[PDB]
Every structure is written in structure tokens, then in C-alpha cells.
Design a protein around this ligand. Structure first.
Ligand SMILES: *[C@@H]1O[C@H](CO)[C@@H](O)[C@H](O)[C@H]1NC(C)=O
Ligand SMILES: *[C@@H]1O[C@H](CO)[C@@H](O)[C@H](O)[C@H]1NC(C)=O
Ligand SMILES: *[C@@H]1O[C@H](CO)[C@@H](O)[C@H](O)[C@H]1NC(C)=O
Ligand SMILES: [Ca+2]
Ligand SMILES: [Cl-]
Ligand SMILES: [Cl-]
Ligand SMILES: [Mg+2]
Length: 416
């Protein structure tokens, strides 16, 4: 039935399936050819020598068009579909593709398959917010310092596992077609074998949005002086994939769509939030944790003895509890008061025929106006303070050895 839970009832860690989060998703592209229609030449090889061809890009024409929708469409090797950029975009100048996922993902690989020859310099970035800000995932260039101001193949140390390497790898042509770029978020990082227990990595792989930027271009022609180049140079890619899973903090087996049309974890274990990053309301007894293989870490309910609908977590009480219970109740109802709403407030006492949860569990003090030396009774017992000859819970009768008078000042008087 439910993978988020045991054979019997018990919370166990759960993860959504690894998928290609890009598939069929519309990517935004800085440029697309065919408006206005345009000719493009491509120089290529029969292995010993250079052969050059020519073609047209027409947005209008399906057979001769190349939309951004071809980046994520179903990839068939034998029948290829390529997005193609404009021409005469080249350093400085970049073509940029961004993919909004609408929700936070754990990204394993970002991978590209190029129709043109691969870029001399390109960069992958991610966004953790919703497309406001961008931090570098990885750089690719022949000259790293000159292009991106990054050292060449910088070692990754435990000290910083979140820096982006810039490599000269995957900058080569050949291939002038079908070159792959595969970026791995966890590759060469010292705590990756430990990922589940490695928060900084768990942060690293977390993205809402993914951006690819192509900067410098190979010139495969390749006259000096005044050369109005006979050859156009562009960027063309048949496939863009980002592999990974919806980020649920181990608290969900799946993500789903809202009544508000938003992708969110279908959150289990008494958790809430788009990432399951925090506890569901009234569930504040212990603090929030990421589910692990060893520990499910379900948010547990506050105990209000059915007298309060909201509570808050107190870390200090949690600690002094032996890290057992930290919740305290808010705005107890039904004339109760205290951490757990476990006692009646002043002016009331605890009727002990009724269970602590009972809505009537706290009776109003009924303290007899004449036989009692004061109005507020004992919260736990119900006993009113009793003037000298008087007894009863309510201070309503005379003791043995005492006789009743008609006086409101002195109701019970000792015999001889
Ligand atoms: C592009 O192809 C379309 C086919 O619908 C054709 O009508 C047009 O003449 C071609 N060139 C353009 C759009 O100028
Ligand atoms: C290539 O794919 C398109 C997609 O509709 C199809 O119309 C076309 O016939 C395919 N070409 C071949 C040779 O299979
Ligand atoms: C193009 O890329 C440069 C460096 O790649 C980047 O700083 C810039 O934001 C991009 N284009 C713009 C915004 O002019
Ligand atoms: Ca394609
Ligand atoms: Cl093409
Ligand atoms: Cl390579
Ligand atoms: Mg092409």
C-alpha cells in the first residue's frame, strides 16, 4: 500500500522515483532561428577531408523549423529533433536556456546532447529560489581564468564541497555532431558516498531552476584580416535532461498537483511545506528532521488534553525532557490552563469524576457565601476555605460538636 509506512502502521523513510524532470517541460531560450527565416551553412567531414553543406531555418515551416520544444521532446536517435539558435551570436554574447521546474528538486545529472559541435565555453547554473538568483553548478572552458575567472580543475576538498569546478574537458571538437555534456552534481565530492548524512551536499543538489549558458564558440572554418566569414556559427541541441527527484526530505513517496495548481510533495509523517521541510500544525512536540534509512523522524502531536487547538515547540523543555517532549499548548479552552492544559484555572476546580479531556473537566467553584471564609476553592480538590465551625467541600455544613446559628458572620458555634 503506502511506502511511506511500515507493513504495520509505522513511518519509514520514503523517496519519490528518480526521473528526468525536464521531459516535455518548456524551456526558455535566449534565441531561436527562423525569425526572420535564414540560411545556415555547416562545415563537416567525410573522415579524410572537409565537406560543407547549406540549409534553411524557417519558423513557419515544420520540416524546416527548430523550436525550443525540441529540447525536451521524446528523443529518438534515428529521427533527431534539434533546437537551433540564431547566428552571429558569439563571444561576447551568449545563448541561454532556462528550465523552471516550479518545485525544488534533488539534481543528480544535467545532460546535453548537441547537434552543432559543443561550445568552447559554457556554464551550468542552478536557482534555489524560483528564478530570482543563480549560483554556478559547473564551468566548461579551454581558458578558465580568462573566460570565467576560475582556476583550472580545482580539487574539491571537504572544506568546500559547494564550489563549481571549471574544466577544459568536454570542450573539444570532434564531435561536430552529437557531442554529449554530462554534469554530475555529486562527482568528485568527498562526502557523496555519504550523501544521506551530508547536509551540505543535500543543499548543493537542490534546485528549482536550471540554467545553461553558452559563451564562446568554436570556429571550424577556419581567413585573417577582413574575413566576413562565409560560415555561420550557432548552437544546436537535440536533447536536454536533468535527472533526479522531487525533494521531500524523505517524508514523501511522491509529488502531486495542488487545488492551486502547484507541484508539492504529497507529504506524510505529520509534515507540511512544499519540501516537507517543517512540521504540520499542532505537531510541534519534537523538532523537525530529515528522514533517514535508520530514522523516519515523524513530527509528533502536541498533547493538549483536547482543550486546545494550537501549540508551540519549546527547545529548552525538549532538552530538559531528555529530548522526549518539547510542546506546550496555547490558549487552553474550557477553563483549563498549563503546559498540557492539564489543570483547571483559578476560580475553578477539577471534577475528578470526569476524565481530563472532558469539556466539563473543570467545575466552577461553588463556595458557600456564609459558611466559607473566602470564595476561591482549591483547584485540585474543590475545597473552599472553611470558617471555624464549618465543613463540607462547599463549606455548607456544621461540624459535629458545633451547632448552626442564624448568623452570616458566625454560622457554627461550639457546644459547651
Ligand atoms: C517559409 O516556409 C513557409 C511555409 O509555410 C513559406 O510559406 C514561406 O515562403 C517560407 N519563407 C518565408 C516564411 O519567408
Ligand atoms: C521524423 O519525425 C517526424 C515527426 O512527426 C516524422 O513526421 C517523420 O516522418 C520522421 N522521419 C523519419 C524518416 O522517420
Ligand atoms: C551572457 O553571459 C554573461 C557571461 O556569460 C552574463 O554575465 C550575462 O548576464 C549574459 N547576458 C546578459 C545578461 O547580458
Ligand atoms: Ca529533441
Ligand atoms: Cl536540426
Ligand atoms: Cl569529452
Ligand atoms: Mg541543425
Amino acid at each position: 500500500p503506502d511506502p511511506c509506512y511500515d507493513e504495520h502502521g509505522l513511518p519509514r523513510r520514503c523517496i519519490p522515483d528518480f526521473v528526468n524532470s525536464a521531459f516535455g517541460k518548456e524551456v526558455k531560450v535566449s534565441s531561436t532561428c527562423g525569425k526572420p527565416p535564414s540560411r545556415y551553412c555547416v562545415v563537416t567531414e567525410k573522415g579524410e577531408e572537409q565537406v560543407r553543406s547549406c540549409h534553411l531555418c524557417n519558423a513557419s515551416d515544420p520540416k524546416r523549423a527548430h523550436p525550443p520544444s525540441f529540447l525536451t521532446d521524446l528523443n529518438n536517435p534515428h529521427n533527431l529533433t534539434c533546437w537551433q539558435s540564431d547566428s552571429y551570436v558569439q563571444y561576447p554574447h551568449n545563448v541561454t536556456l532556462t528550465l523552471s521546474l516550479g518545485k525544488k528538486f534533488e539534481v543528480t545529472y544535467v545532460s546535453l546532447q548537441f547537434c552543432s559541435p559543443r561550445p568552447e565555453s559554457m556554464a551550468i547554473y542552478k536557482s534555489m529560489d524560483y528564478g530570482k538568483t543563480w549560483v554556478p553548478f559547473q564551468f566548461y572552458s579551454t581558458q578558465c581564468r580568462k573566460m570565467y575567472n576560475k582556476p583550472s580543475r580545482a580539487a574539491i576538498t571537504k572544506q568546500n564541497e559547494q564550489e563549481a569546478i571549471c574544466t577544459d574537458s568536454h570542450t573539444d571538437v570532434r564531435p561536430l555532431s552529437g557531442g554529449l555534456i554530462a554534469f554530475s552534481t555529486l562527482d568528485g565530492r568527498p562526502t557523496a558516498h555519504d550523501f544521506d548524512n551530508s547536509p551540505v551536499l543535500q543543499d548543493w543538489v537542490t534546485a528549482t531552476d536550471i540554467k545553461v549558458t553558452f559563451s564562446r564558440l568554436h570556429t571550424f572554418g577556419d581567413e585573417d584580416d577582413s574575413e566576413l566569414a562565409r560560415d555561420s556559427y550557432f548552437y544546436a541541441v537535440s536533447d536536454l535532461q536533468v535527472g533526479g527527484r522531487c525533494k521531500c526530505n524523505g517524508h514523501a513517496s511522491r509529488c502531486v498537483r495542488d487545488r492551486d495548481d502547484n507541484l508539492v510533495c504529497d507529504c506524510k509523517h505529520n509534515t507540511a511545506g512544499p519540501e516537507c521541510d517543517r512540521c504540520k500544525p499542532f505537531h510541534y512536540d519534537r523538532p523537525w528532521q530529515r528522514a533517514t534509512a535508520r530514522e523516519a523522524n515523524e513530527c509528533v502531536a502536541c498533547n493538549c488534553n483536547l482543550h486546545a487547538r494550537r501549540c508551540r515547540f519549546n527547545m529548552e523543555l525538549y532538552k530538559l525532557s531528555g529530548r522526549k517532549s518539547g510542546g506546550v499548548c496555547l490558549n487552553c479552552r474550557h477553563n483549563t490552563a498549563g503546559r498540557h492544559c492539564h489543570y483547571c484555572k483559578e476560580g475553578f476546580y477539577r471534577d475528578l469524576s470526569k476524565p481530563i479531556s472532558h469539556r466539563k473537566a473543570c467545575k466552577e467553584c461553588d463556595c458557600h457565601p456564609v459558611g466559607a471564609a473566602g470564595q476561591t476553592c482549591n483547584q485540585t480538590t474543590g475545597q473552599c476555605p472553611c470558617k471555624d465551625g464549618v465543613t463540607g467541600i462547599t463549606c455548607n455544613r456544621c461540624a459535629k460538636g458545633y451547632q448552626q446559628s442564624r448568623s452570616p458572620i458566625a454560622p457554627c458555634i461550639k457546644i459547651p
